[PDB]
Structures are given as C-alpha cells and as structure tokens.
Amino acid sequence: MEMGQLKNKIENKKKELIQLVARHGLDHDKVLLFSRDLDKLINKFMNVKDKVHKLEHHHHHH
Amino acid sequence: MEMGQLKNKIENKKKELIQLVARHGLDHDKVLLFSRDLDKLINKFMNVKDKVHKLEHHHHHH
Numbered sequence: 001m002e003m004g005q006l007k008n009k010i011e012n013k014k015k016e017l018i019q020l021v022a023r024h025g026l027d028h029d030k031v032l033l034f035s036r037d038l039d040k041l042i043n044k045f046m047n048v049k050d051k052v053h054k055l056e057h058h059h060h061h062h
Numbered sequence: 063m064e065m066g067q068l069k070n071k072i073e074n075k076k077k078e079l080i081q082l083v084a085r086h087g088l089d090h091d092k093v094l095l096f097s098r099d100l101d102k103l104i105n106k107f108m109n110v111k112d113k114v115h116k117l118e119h120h121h122h123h124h
Binding site for chain 1: 065068071072075076078079082083085086088092095096099100103104107108110
C-alpha cells in the first residue's frame with residue numbers, strides 16, 4: 001500500500017486544510033508560515049523527532 | 063459568512079489529516095498530542111482562539 005502514497009494523501013489533506021485556514025482570512029505570508037510550521041509538526045511525528053531546540057535564554061529570561 | 067461552518071470544515075479536514083498521520087504509525091498518545099498541538103497551531107493563525115485569552119499554563123495550553 002506504500003507509505004509514500006500514504007504520505008501523498010497526508011500532503012493532499014494537509015494542503016486541503018491549509019486552503020481552509022487560508023480562506024478563513026490569511027494572507028499569503030500567513031499561509032506560508034502556517035504551512036511550513038504545520039509541516040514541521042507533521043515531520044516531527046512522522047519521522048524526524050527534531051528535539052534540538054536552541055534555547056537562547058536559559059533558565060533566566062533576562 | 064458563517065465561519066462556524068467554515069470551522070466545521072477546518073475541524074473535519076484537520077481530523078481527516080490526523081487520521082492519516084495517525085494510521086502511519088502514530089500511537090494513541092501520538093494522535094492525541096498531534097491533534098491538540100495542531101488545533102492550537104491553527105487557532106494561532108486564525109487568531110480565533112476564542113474571544114477570551116484563558117490562562118491555562120504559561121499563558122495558554124492545550
């Protein structure tokens with residue numbers, strides 16, 4: 001059944017959704033930001049568990 | 063004009079996607095995490111995070 005096809009359906013459905021969030025009232029920059037952030041969240045769960053988050057402020061904010 | 067029906071579509075589509083990301087290998091806890099954090103991301107960009115700003119944890123939390 002191929003996970004590549006599964007991923008393709010994910011892409012499609014995610015994109016169908018992006019269109020919905022977009023038509024809500026997002027401008028293209030918002031759509032770009034949303035879609036890419038959305039994509040990383042998906043990739044996080046789908047494959048890459050990118051936990052290497054750079055913390056600039058550590059413990060104390062100032 | 064009704065954004066309730068629009069949101070109804072967003073929710074449904076979001077969940078259509080979630081069910082696809084989920085069936086890929088995500089466990090039950092994974093689905094729960096993904097769905098709630100995805101919801102949050104959408105609300106963020108929609109700016110529709112309800113007409114209040116509920117303190118939940120640091121600021122909000124879902």
